[PDB]
Design a protein around this ligand. Structure first.
Ligand SMILES: CCC1=C(C)/C(=C/C2=NC(=C\c3[nH]c(/C=C4\NC(=O)[C@H](C)[C@H]4CC)c(C)c3CCC(=O)O)/C(CCC(=O)O)=C2C)NC1=O
Ligand SMILES: CCC1=C(C)/C(=C/C2=NC(=C\c3[nH]c(/C=C4\NC(=O)[C@H](C)[C@H]4CC)c(C)c3CCC(=O)O)/C(CCC(=O)O)=C2C)NC1=O
Ligand SMILES: CCC1=C(C)/C(=C/C2=NC(=C\c3[nH]c(/C=C4\NC(=O)[C@H](C)[C@H]4CC)c(C)c3CCC(=O)O)/C(CCC(=O)O)=C2C)NC1=O
Ligand SMILES: CCC1=C(C)/C(=C/C2=NC(=C\c3[nH]c(/C=C4\NC(=O)[C@H](C)[C@H]4CC)c(C)c3CCC(=O)O)/C(CCC(=O)O)=C2C)NC1=O
Ligand SMILES: CCC1=C(C)/C(=C/C2=NC(=C\c3[nH]c(/C=C4\NC(=O)[C@H](C)[C@H]4CC)c(C)c3CCC(=O)O)/C(CCC(=O)O)=C2C)NC1=O
Ligand SMILES: CCC1=C(C)/C(=C/C2=NC(=C\c3[nH]c(/C=C4\NC(=O)[C@H](C)[C@H]4CC)c(C)c3CCC(=O)O)/C(CCC(=O)O)=C2C)NC1=O
Ligand SMILES: CCC1=C(C)/C(=C/C2=NC(=C\c3[nH]c(/C=C4\NC(=O)[C@H](C)[C@H]4CC)c(C)c3CCC(=O)O)/C(CCC(=O)O)=C2C)NC1=O
Ligand SMILES: CCC1=C(C)/C(=C/C2=NC(=C\c3[nH]c(/C=C4\NC(=O)[C@H](C)[C@H]4CC)c(C)c3CCC(=O)O)/C(CCC(=O)O)=C2C)NC1=O
Ligand SMILES: CCC1=C(C)/C(=C/C2=NC(=C\c3[nH]c(/C=C4\NC(=O)[C@H](C)[C@H]4CC)c(C)c3CCC(=O)O)/C(CCC(=O)O)=C2C)NC1=O
Ligand SMILES: CCC1=C(C)/C(=C/C2=NC(=C\c3[nH]c(/C=C4\NC(=O)[C@H](C)[C@H]4CC)c(C)c3CCC(=O)O)/C(CCC(=O)O)=C2C)NC1=O
Lengths: 48, 68, 161, 162, 48, 145, 160, 172, 160, 161, 161, 172
């Protein structure tokens, strides 16, 4: 981290990185695929 | 919004005709920008000469206001 | 057509420029006069018929124009003439709201000079009919709006002559 | 913005643990207290108009000279900016009442107060006297725990200005 | 230290390096730079 | 021409709104086809024959006002009704009036007219049903599909 | 503008403006200075915006910038950000006009045909615009950010 | 940091006015449901270890590549880092749930996280999945706990889900 | 309304509402309570407003109420004020709708033909409406009086 | 068509009544929800295409419907079906803005049941396509607007069945 | 319009001549190249879009033409330009099938030079767009058809200049 | 850090030379005018608070949006930051004025400043204006002070202006 090349030293790096926004991939529908996932009522019962 | 003013001469190639018909063959009239074009085709696809086309309403440069 | 605002946008678009300080100053000069334009339009619209009647009375009728041999002789042609008058008034009101005369060229002046030559319609007499409606308008709309309404009537009348 | 919930959440984050009982217990307090707070808030909200005009005037009645020419309680703009400023204070008091902490006051009025007042030649005494008056009248708009809440925050501003 | 980083960096730039040299991390937030810069304005360099 | 487009009942009420259009026609600036087209693009048309009906009866009403008949087959409803869904009324009207069929049948001047067509199957009776209903008598779609 | 739109509807029905039409011109013009401020802020940060949109885009779609991608390479990427600069500009125009007339004639009517020819994936251009919304919106007050956001979502809508 | 009240306050201030009786009652309702909220946060805290453990067992059941050499949850050091991240995210989700606002989650945890993982070579899709599993089990616990008064917690279960779903979306 | 007008234009061009159209709905709805207050005040003084319009009318045109006048007599005058009551009502409707759709279908389209049949002098009905503007406007604040005034001048305009 | 506001005006007009307290309360109940309707429309419009794609994916495709013998077999019919879907979405957005379902009757439902019977278009399958778009919409628009958007999708679907 | 078979008939009809040996030789010279014309048209038609894309890429875009101030700036005008390109390609394919340029005069060139002068459309740039499509076409259609396709592109381009 | 002499020296050294008789006398003149320079720097120091205050009053008189909610000099915290920046810039301008060289101003104050403000959402055009107002008042004081010997300070007033103008240009 040194200034000898100009002498002045660089402009702050993080100003633009610091302010990048949230961002709203909104809506969004999830995915079950993936592999086929069980559905049915039997799931509890088999277990029982 | 823009308008073209065009002159067309279309003859009758099937049938002759029998009653005055003079405005139905050689006419001039204002036509809109959106069609003037697909009417440019109907006229030339019916074997008609198109004699002259003038802009009338809009500005040659465009960009804005044209779309109205 | 274009108004004050789209006049500026299209002038910059052809240069692909974002709006700069000079542009922003022009648009302000329009917005800052906007409320006054609206009030003036409401006066003209609601007095439309009276403006035509007072303008015709000062500049057209009681004359050779309305007598046999005159172009506004016959109820047909008298009707056509004051019909025209209503167009002028109405469009000038559009131009003044828009703060741009481009609509007066696109939808009113284009070909009109020759149309009038072809029918025999007296041009000089029509201009007086325009400048009489301006006179009436300038009284009705008041100090606020008088100069701004007036210019588009003057645009119309130097468009024919 | 400093509030009960925010503070406890921050504590948890710093400790990098989990919302345990201590935290939950503390948070309940803030929830249980909301009713009194929010009653104070509604009363201060609808009386705002008059609370502000009352306090503005009282600044001139306690500092008569302010309203003479060449002074800072003279002309429409000073007197306008004054009403506004007391209105800012009452606004943040209601916010602090609704929020469950001093955060809104700390972030929007306390941080920087003295530097600003010193550059602009604004005496805290006026503002204390505006608030002392607002405190007098709020004595009869509220009572019980809503009054205690209103008082807590008015006094907080007076202490902040001092 | 003074010469090398504070003297020729803006405040923003200067503040980034103290986080690097002193705490071994980047400033987590935009507010974090606000606090430091401000403290510089009232208390001066040494306090900062 | 207000009785062909607009249809009789509502053409009785027209007084003078289209009067700038009439001047142009009178003065030979536009042909009868331009006048007809322009009176289909007007708000009165749109209000009367488009805003209160489902998009497939809009095509049917328009067929009978600018062309004379009813939709001939199904490869049409599909063509013209999917140009109204896509672009609104002015493209639907603009298309009918610039077709080959309109040009053959009506040409430059000739106000459009009701033709009782003979061919394709069912075109005649479908059309005659449409033709003999006064405005608002029945608003079912005759040719749903 | 709002003016052009109101008038065109007026003239087409051969009439003076409605009370409604007059009201919207009045409300619109009252927001003039605010709308001008919204355009200024965004004009002032254009280079930053176009860039943060471009990062957000290439994370979400590293493929566009991949062997068989429309924006693959340094100068196929340079033109891509230039197009993002174009659309931000049009968005500032729209905000000061109070409608899309200008935005539309300049950059959506014909855009399907243009990009289909160039074989540019349209829906990833729509993503680049969402990315710009996110950046631009973080430089504006809540109220101004919403007002701006409508015009971003329009462009996103028209590329569809 | 924001909570649901603080959020209201910031939006009000940007208008330069006081509460819009609208916002007041929205917040009165949050106070109304706050005992349920405390139970919901308590459900997560009281089962944090099992929620992480069970999510974990299942993540590696599905993705046996992560625990092979070459895999991002191999050797012990990396597995401990992965288990630690599962805890960190579950932590900030519980904070958001006490707060009634996602901001603490987005600002301290999710902001930059995806780009961290990509720099590291950590497969973000696997991390997203681990978050989906934590969600399933966490909500399980929110819905079926020790002698809590019987009522309807679906509003809170949804809200908790959106915090899990924010994190997943942000990371994948 | 403003809503109906915006939507009808939207549907007719097969599209979602414009930023402009959305903006005017927003500005319109913000003026809701104010517009409702303007209608209330005028509804509350309806009987007075007709009585003062009716006096202003008969001074300016004593002939209408004269041997060969359409409104000559006690019950030809009673119906005349009832018509003035009708139009004030429609004006309150217009103000709360923010445009004329309702005013128009109910009382201007067909009005020439109706009154021509009854042989009522149309331009003196327009005067009766100006007279109502004058009275109603004196019961409203400057800002609300203007907003009301646009709808009075519309009716005056349509009878023309 | 009619909206909330014109629904009230026409209900009073037929009685020739000036708007009274009950009327004024109804109109307030509309105006007070207005800003939220606008925001919701902007979300739907700008996510239009994604809503259709997610709704088709959950309720139409990967099925016998898209296979030979199915009504959305052929690119022609697949295109017609998602074209329809766009109509529904778009009009429901109009109904929700207007706060009145009357437009859904006038311009969408009238004759549609029989049109679908005549072409063979499966009604039950179309309803699922409507109720899947509702599901997606209700996520995207949020607490503020979810219930209000939802009802006009439910209006559409009980209009077919 | 006319084609090689038709032109031979009308050229003789005006002289009232039976088709004689010279005529019959001309018609043979057309028929004998006919199968090759058909194959060439099927290549052009099915590569239409790619030919325009490659022709624009070599002769129009990446230039001042597509930049602000340029005639193919704006999506509107870019669309109009490649629309035109498709006309040229399509009609040249007709001319080459017919073995007669008369259709290029009747339905494409007549008035087009002045139309372009009136709009400001750059003629020289349009010719390069024509001669670039020819270049692509001549590769795709092969030895059999290259010279025959080429001439009607050259007819088009000397029709503008 | 450079001053006007140090600058001379650096340029001489880059030639490998002892200072030119040209450069020598340019520096002899700076020593000639140095009492005036000290008064000029003293004019600013002695009225720093008022220069900032008066610039401020006038900035917000012109731009009443900054002090509304939504505005960048609202609430107290932001106004204090803005007042602080006015002081910081006036301070480095006075340093440059003692030095006879802009470098301290460019290197510790102006370098990166614009990009800071843009990151923050601080309207740079307003900041530029605040600097223009400080200039007007500062020079006012340089020109009309307490019992300083009468003479011509226009050379120094110009030079001070260029430092104010550098800052403005750099920021806007
Ligand atoms: C040959 C076709 C033709 C006709 C009929 C015609 C009528 C006509 N009547 C006029 C005025 C007038 N006409 C009348 C007529 C009447 N007042 C009444 O109350 C009665 C109902 C009616 C008498 C039976 C009056 C009073 C005026 C003056 C109106 C004014 O100056 O405002 C004028 C304007 C004055 C002028 O410049 O001449 C014209 C042109 N012009 C024509 O070219
Ligand atoms: C968000 C919280 C917040 C607070 C509290 C606030 C205070 C504040 N008061 C100010 C001015 C002022 N404040 C007052 C106050 C008063 N004048 C009188 O008549 C009375 C004596 C007194 C009221 C008790 C006056 C006169 C000014 C104008 C000072 C000037 O510019 O000369 C200014 C300078 C900017 C401006 O001119 O508006 C600030 C920042 N600003 C904020 O943003
Ligand atoms: C929308 C813009 C627009 C305008 C302005 C317009 C003018 C216009 N005026 C016309 C005729 C006319 N214009 C007038 C005008 C006048 N007579 C006089 O003596 C006076 C000097 C003057 C009135 C002040 C008359 C008398 C005619 C009828 C000529 C004839 O008998 O054919 C015609 C011929 C068609 C027709 O008769 O309607 C047009 C098109 N048309 C348009 O589309
Ligand atoms: C503006 C209001 C409006 C609506 C809603 C409308 C619907 C409508 N859907 C149609 C056909 C159709 N509609 C569908 C719809 C579907 N196929 C399926 O399997 C699914 C269950 C469903 C989509 C979810 C299909 C496949 C056809 C084509 C039937 C045919 O091949 O003829 C047709 C016949 C004309 C045409 O093909 O375009 C109309 C008019 N028309 C209108 O004007
Ligand atoms: C130490 C911090 C702290 C906690 C944790 C706390 C919990 C707490 N939960 C309560 C109620 C409750 N809690 C629940 C929660 C649930 N109901 C279900 O069926 C679900 C399985 C579960 C969903 C989260 C319900 C339904 C009630 C009764 C309704 C209510 O009071 O809102 C009550 C009211 C008294 C009661 O009815 O038991 C308290 C005090 N109070 C506190 O001070
Ligand atoms: C017989 C007329 C006919 C065709 C052609 C047809 C295609 C068709 N392709 C589909 C999906 C698909 N088609 C592809 C095809 C491709 N992906 C690529 O990148 C390549 C360019 C291309 C392979 C060459 C893919 C990847 C999907 C899955 C898209 C998704 O699920 O979102 C689907 C939806 C899945 C289903 O329900 O079947 C249909 C209906 N349907 C028809 O009725
Ligand atoms: C103001 C209205 C307007 C627009 C928008 C416009 C766009 C435009 N984009 C172009 C190319 C391009 N545009 C892109 C853009 C992208 N690549 C991707 O994969 C992404 C989806 C996207 C960036 C977000 C790329 C990669 C090219 C180069 C394509 C090529 O050279 O084949 C070109 C051809 C190069 C040129 O001559 O300038 C034009 C004209 N022109 C206009 O007049
Ligand atoms: C069926 C035979 C036929 C042809 C060929 C035809 C050409 C034609 N090109 C036009 C415009 C145009 N033509 C171009 C063409 C170009 N721009 C450039 O910069 C390039 C040099 C060039 C493409 C290679 C452009 C940009 C316009 C739009 C001018 C305007 O903005 O008004 C127009 C005006 C109407 C319209 O805009 O559609 C016509 C009629 N019309 C026809 O009926
Ligand atoms: C190197 C010397 C240096 C400069 C120049 C500097 C500028 C600077 N100004 C800042 C903020 C600020 N600057 C202003 C300034 C203004 N607001 C307005 O509306 C006016 C147009 C303008 C005053 C004329 C405001 C209001 C903020 C706070 C923004 C916020 O937090 O919302 C910040 C963010 C950190 C903080 O708030 O302390 C920096 C770094 N920092 C430095 O270290
Ligand atoms: C403690 C640090 C320090 C200071 C401040 C200092 C000032 C100082 N200023 C001086 C002169 C002066 N100073 C000025 C300054 C001005 N003339 C004007 O009319 C302007 C308003 C103002 C412009 C800046 C002038 C004109 C002279 C006399 C000429 C000269 O000596 O150069 C002198 C020479 C003695 C005298 O003539 O009074 C001294 C010692 N000496 C020091 O050691």
């Amino acid at each position: 981290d040194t200034d000898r090349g100009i002498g002045a030293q660089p402009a702050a790096k993080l100003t633009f990185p610091l302010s990048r926004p949230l961002g709203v991939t909104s809506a969004y529908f999830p995915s079950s695929q993936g592999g086929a996932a069980t559905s049915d009522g039997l799931e509890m019962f088999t277990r029982m | 919004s823009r308008y073209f003013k065009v002159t067309a001469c279309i003859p009758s190639l099937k049938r002759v005709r029998t009653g005055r018909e003079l405005q139905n063959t050689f006419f001039t009239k204002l036509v809109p920008y959106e069609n003037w074009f697909t009417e440019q085709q109907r006229i030339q696809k019916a074997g008609g000469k198109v004699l002259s086309v003038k802009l009338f309403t809009g500005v040659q440069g465009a960009n804005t206001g044209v779309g109205a | 057509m274009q108004d004050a605002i789209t006049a500026v946008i299209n002038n910059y678009d052809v240069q692909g420029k974002y709006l700069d300080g000079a542009a922003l100053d022009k648009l302000k000069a329009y917005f800052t006069t906007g409320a006054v334009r609206v009030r003036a339009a409401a006066v003209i619209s609601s007095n439309a018929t009276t403006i035509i009647k007072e303008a015709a009375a000062k500049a057209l009728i009681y004359s050779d124009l309305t007598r046999p041999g005159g172009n506004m002789y016959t109820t047909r042609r008298y009707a056509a003439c004051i019909r025209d008058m209503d167009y002028f008034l109405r469009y000038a009101t559009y131009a003044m709201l828009a703060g741009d005369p481009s609509i007066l060229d696109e939808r009113v002046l284009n070909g009109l000079k020759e149309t009038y030559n072809s029918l025999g319609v007296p041009i000089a007499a029509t201009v007086g009919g325009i400048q009489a409606m301006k006179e009436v308008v300038g009284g009705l709309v008041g100090p606020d709006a008088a100069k701004e309404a007036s210019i588009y009537f003057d645009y119309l009348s130097s468009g024919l002559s | 913005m400093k509030t009960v919930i925010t503070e406890v959440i921050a504590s948890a984050d710093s400790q990098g643990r989990f919302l345990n009982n201590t935290e939950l217990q503390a948070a309940n307090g803030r929830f249980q207290r909301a009713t009194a707070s929010m009653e104070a808030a509604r009363a201060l909200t609808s009386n705002a108009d008059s609370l502000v005009k009352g306090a503005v005037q009282e600044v001139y009645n306690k500092f008569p000279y302010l309203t003479q020419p060449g002074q800072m309680g003279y002309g429409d703009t000073n007197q306008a900016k004054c009403a506004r400023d007391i209105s800012h204070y009452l606004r943040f008091i209601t916010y602090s009442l609704v929020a469950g902490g001093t955060g809104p006051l700390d972030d929007y009025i306390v941080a920087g107060l003295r530097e600003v007042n010193r550059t602009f030649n604004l005496s805290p005494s006026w503002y204390i006297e505006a608030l002392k008056h607002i405190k007098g009248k709020v004595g009869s708009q509220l009572s019980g725990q809503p009054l205690t809440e209103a008082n807590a925050y008015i006094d907080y501003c007076i202490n902040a200005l001092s | 230290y003074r010469d090398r980083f504070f003297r020729t960096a803006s405040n923003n730039r200067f503040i980034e390096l103290n986080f690097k040299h002193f705490l071994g991390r980047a400033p987590y937030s935009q507010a974090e730079i606000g606090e430091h810069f401000n403290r510089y304005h009232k208390s001066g360099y040494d306090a900062e | 021409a207000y009785v062909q487009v607009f249809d009789k009942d509502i053409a009785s009420y027209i007084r003078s709104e289209f009067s700038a259009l009439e001047s142009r026609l009178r003065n030979r600036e536009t042909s009868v086809k331009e006048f007809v087209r322009l009176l289909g693009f007007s708000a009165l048309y749109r209000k009367q024959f488009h805003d209160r009906y489902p998009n497939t009866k809009v095509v049917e009403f328009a067929f009978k006002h600018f062309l004379g008949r009813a939709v001939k087959n199904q490869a049409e409803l599909i063509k013209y009704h999917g140009l109204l869904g896509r672009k609104g009324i002015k493209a639907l009207i603009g298309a009918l009036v610039d077709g080959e069929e309109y040009g053959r049948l009506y040409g430059e001047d000739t106000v459009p007219s009701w033709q009782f067509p003979t061919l394709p199957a069912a075109n005649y009776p479908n059309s005659v049903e449409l033709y003999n209903r006064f405005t608002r008598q029945d608003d079912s779609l005759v040719v749903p599909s | 503008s709002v003016l052009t739109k109101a008038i065109v509807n007026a003239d087409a029905e051969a009439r003076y403006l409605s009370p409604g039409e007059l009201d919207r011109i009045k409300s619109f013009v009252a927001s003039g200075e605010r709308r001008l401020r919204i355009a200024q802020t965004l004009t002032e940060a254009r280079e930053r915006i176009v860039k943060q949109a471009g990062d957000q885009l290439f994370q979400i779609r590293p493929d566009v910038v991949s062997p068989g991608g429309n924006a693959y390479g340094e100068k196929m990427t340079a033109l891509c950000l230039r197009d993002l600069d174009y659309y931000l500009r049009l968005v500032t125009y729209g905000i000061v006009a109070g409608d899309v007339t200008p935005i539309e004639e300049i950059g959506i009517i014909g855009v399907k045909e243009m990009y289909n020819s160039l074989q540019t994936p349209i829906p990833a251009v729509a993503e680049g615009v969402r990315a710009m919304k996110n950046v631009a919106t973080s430089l504006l007050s809540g109220d101004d950010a919403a007002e701006a956001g409508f015009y971003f979502d329009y462009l996103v809508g028209a590329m569809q | 940091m924001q909570d649901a009240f603080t959020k209201a306050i910031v939006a009000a201030d940007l208008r330069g006015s006081f509460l819009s009786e609208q916002e007041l009652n929205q917040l009165t309702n949050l106070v109304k449901e706050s005992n349920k909220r405390l139970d919901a946060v308590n459900a997560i805290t009281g089962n944090a270890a099992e929620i992480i453990s069970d999510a974990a067992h299942k993540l590696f059941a599905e993705q046996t590549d992560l625990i092979r050499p070459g895999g991002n949850a191999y050797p012990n050091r990396r597995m401990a880092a992965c288990l630690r991240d599962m805890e960190i995210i579950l932590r900030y989700v519980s904070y958001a749930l006490l707060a009634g606002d996602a901001s603490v989650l987005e600002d301290r945890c999710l902001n930059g996280l995806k780009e961290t993982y990509v720099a590291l070579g950590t497969p973000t899709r696997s991390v997203a999945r681990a978050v989906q599993l934590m969600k399933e089990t966490a909500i399980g616990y929110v819905n079926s706990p020790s002698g809590v008064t019987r009522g309807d917690c679906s509003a809170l279960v949804n809200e908790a889900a959106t915090y899990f779903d924010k994190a997943a979306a942000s990371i994948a």
